[PDB]
Amino acid sequence: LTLNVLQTMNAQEYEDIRAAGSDERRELTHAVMRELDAPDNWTMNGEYGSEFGGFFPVQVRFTPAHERFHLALCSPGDVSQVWVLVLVNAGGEPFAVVQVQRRFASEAVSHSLALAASLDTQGYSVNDIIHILMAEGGQ
Amino acid sequence: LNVLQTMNAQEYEDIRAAGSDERRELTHAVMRELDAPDNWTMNGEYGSEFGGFFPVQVRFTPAHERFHLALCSPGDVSQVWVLVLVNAGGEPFAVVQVQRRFASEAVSHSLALAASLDTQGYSVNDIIHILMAEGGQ
């Protein structure tokens, strides 16, 4: 499971690995995470069962230490044809899709995360962080 | 009911954005149109305890908790209502039904069929394949 393999796989092929089993899915999740860089003092966690809702064959969450909000990277599958990066405030609002990608673009995700982090450190509100990330994300 | 059918994805997100009270009222209005099968519970997301992906998200769960279904509203993530079935452990999983416009009776019917098949001892894999046919997926 190289970066190129992760990029060429369609929505059904993501659902196919989830369908193959828990160990197969876990492998896929780790390969996605291996391509990503979590910002300093943030945690990065993948979903291995349905603890994150189970909606996406791969779901990776990135959370700042204070945990006021998180971002979730959601893979192609039955729900969405494209990779989706969302920002969710605790309590569900504000919320936005800040970026969509047709093909897995790893460096782009990590940069948006790096941007989210520094904006957070710099004391920007969640609303302002969403508005900025959407512009950075072409959204 | 008619307002729910008439609202586009962006109005769903505008209500969640307006505030927690406004979102709660929208969640309850959706839930009021639906019927949970006997011995199942129905719960709506009020914050981000179901992930917060959808302006309205309603979960339907049998008491045995081997699996559940979630109805997910239009918004940023999806232009359409989706009904998904999630097994314990995240697999098997499927979208069993998609709706461009909220069809409350069709959701309740799909849920009653899932409950019916489950009692009759169908595997979750088989319930998925059957509900997808019933749901037009």
Q: Which residues of A touch B92 (CB under 8 A)?
A: 19
Q: What is the distance between the alpha carbons of residues B113 and B121, in angstroms, rounded to a whole number?
A: 12
Say yes or no for a CB contact (<8 Å) between A92 and B19: no
Nearest-neighbour CA in chain A from B43: distance (Å)? 14
**Nearest to B30, CA basis, from B57, B60, B66, B50:** B57
- Quote the CA–CA distance of A33 and A21 in Å, as a whole number: 18
The CATH number that domain A1-139 falls under is: 3.40.50.11880
What does CATH list as the number for B1-137? 3.40.50.11880
Q: Which residue among A18, A84, A97 sits closest to B91, beta carbon to beta carbon?
A: A18
Contact A93/B16, CB-based, under 8 Å?
Answer: yes
CA distances (Å), origin B128, targets A15, A97, B122, B131, B133: 14, 29, 10, 5, 9
Q: Is A48 on the interface with B (CB under 8 A)?
A: yes
Instruction: Give the sheet arrangement for strand A95-101, strand by strand.
Output: A43-46, A59-63, A69-74, A83-89, A95-101
Q: Locate the chain A residue with the closest alpha carbon to B74.
A: A79
Query: Which sequence spans correspond to the domains of chain A?
Result: 1-139
Instruction: Judge if the upstream peptide bond of residue B37 is cis by omega within 30 degrees of 0.
Output: no
Per CB-CB distance under 8 Å, the chain B contacts of A79 are 72, 77-78, 82, 84, 95
Residue appearing with tokens 């609303």: A127
Pinpoint the alpha helices (H) of chain B.
2-6, 9-18, 20-32, 104-119, 124-135
**Shortest distance, CA A22 to any CA of chain B (angstroms):** 8
Query: Which residue do the tokens 């950075």 mark?
Result: A136
Residues from chain A contacting residue B88 (CB–CB below 8 Å): 49-50
